[model samples]
Target: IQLDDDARVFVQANMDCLPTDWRLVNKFDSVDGVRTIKYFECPGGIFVSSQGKKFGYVQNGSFKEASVSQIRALLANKVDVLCTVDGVNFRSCCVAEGEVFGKTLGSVFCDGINVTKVRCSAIYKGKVFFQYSDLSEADLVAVKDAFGFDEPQLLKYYTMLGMCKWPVVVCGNYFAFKQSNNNCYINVACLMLQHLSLKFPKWQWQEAWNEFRSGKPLRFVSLVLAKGSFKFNEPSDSIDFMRVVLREADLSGATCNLEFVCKCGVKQEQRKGVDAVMHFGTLDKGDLVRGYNIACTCGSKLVHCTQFNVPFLICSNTPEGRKLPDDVVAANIFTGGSVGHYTHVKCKPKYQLYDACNVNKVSEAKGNFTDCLYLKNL
Candidate 1:
């Protein structure tokens, strides 16, 4: 029942018992044809018989070759015959009426009728009809048609046999976050739009700050208006004025979406009036060691950013001095006016820009501080 590599070996080993004693006879011929002759006791019977059997008055030649169709015709009447090929096995068989019956090298038959069992290499075409039995010509035709000889057909067969099992492999890195103790988390708001006055600054800041304060307990909020220009001495005072208007907006079923793809962390402990500290890990060392600190609001505690911790490996280095870490730390420190009325202040490692805005802003201002304002917005 199994069509496997072992089946080929079994078929070849028992070829002698086949009703038609056939052996692998030729190796070079491309056509599906065979040469057959009656076996006799005489020595060199193959040469003698081949020379003698000239049905027509034709000049003598070597052994006669028969097409597959012609050989089938001869097999139609003969009770027994010896079949041979160069790669196939030698076997014997008997034919009774129109049916074939006999022992193959690996199988036995009760009558010269149906093939009760078969162990030979499976053939995909031709019919084996039983004129007076339950088996019909159509049945044999169906069996012949069922054999598959193409790559897709073979793949499907083996797949069905359950030979295509393998393991599932998932690939990616996971991240977490850590924080410091003294800073108080606050929301900052700022109006970036040009000509916007601070007359409404306190009101805007309170509105945005309240929304963040009441909405799901966020760690910090920064609201910025791209049109305004302002400065602050400390990161806390700078972050306070940045907060502005805030309200809940439905995001479900929206075509446009913003997805956060990077890991970020905020320190929980406050140093002096700053509650946040920027921590760093070195790339040159084998152990991912923590390094620097950037200050935020005083008495502020970290509530979020836990999922931002990652392995300490660095990223690809370029021919120039553009070696990036595998995972980089990023944080937003509010640095402008009141709670909801300030701009975003970002801190990053030494070699890299605080945000991705440095290169563009630096290039635009010809590397001057005026161009630097744009980088802070990032």
Candidate 2:
């Protein structure tokens, strides 16, 4: 057969094989008392080769060769694999069930097509299973008991056709529901948190919800700490959690007098909104909230101006800023930091601190002020 460019190039570059040196030969071979259907060796030294291509490296002076079928078999055994109903061989990891497909696995995989011969994979240990169970009144009762709501009952009924496990069952159905409804509602967010509690059983669901409802959202760091599981033990985990909950949360009418402070203690505010802040669009999925890389003159990252250096969101229509009255020059409202004492000079809220010896010269390369909320530095 013809050698593909990738395999040809790999062998030529790494194995020190010439363009014409390699040739495919069909030969029967036996090794370690095991028999093979087809086998061949290239002119190059120890390296992996299989079905026109393969990849592996030397380990303890021994090389291993893998094939398409071999890899697929391994995936079928270890990872979740959804079988296509039409009997078309889907390459490994093509839309696994319980993740995105939910109960509608085989039906969707086959595209509702008519087929007969069903190809299957051997599930390593006792075979993995999916069984149908009618949602009983007791099931709804349990959901209500857990969340103190009736929404999950509707959620279960809406997504119940086939049954999966407990946590994954709800999670899968919730994903389908979310896809169906583009907007995030409080009920759905509550359901999402229900799954979170089931998965990370130790998470403080009540406490988190209490804070979230009181117009003070908890931080991902705090959430991870509360969950206390290896599932949320990384930075990416917190980011994902934030995206899942914070980004998905429908905080449209929520409001707070937001402030921002750099790690180096520099505080900034848009002079126009210095006394009357804007709505909570910045806390929401708004563009101004997107790029959070607000670096300070001290090279420290500016954090969200939250309550008492605590975590999270919202602002209102005609949202008033937390600044003191016109004649007063007191400390910052949320952060009680000094505003530089000079009784004779009016303490305008540190807006124009920019000097000629600018440290952030790269700021010149930045786009127009309309791109994001502007803040000049000294």
Instruction: Give RMSD to native, each candidate.
Output: 28.5, 21.6
TM-score to native of every candidate shown? 0.14, 0.20
**Cα error of candidate 1 at position 195, Å:** 28
lDDT of each: 0.24, 0.29
Candidate 2 global lDDT: 0.29
lDDT of 2 by residue, 73-143 (tens): 33232334544211222233333211323332332212112111234423311222221134346544543
lDDT of 1 by residue, 11-80 (tens): 3343454434343331222112323232221122221112122211101333553332333334343444
lDDT of 1 at 202: 30
TM-score quality measure for candidate 2: 0.20
RMSD of 2: 21.6
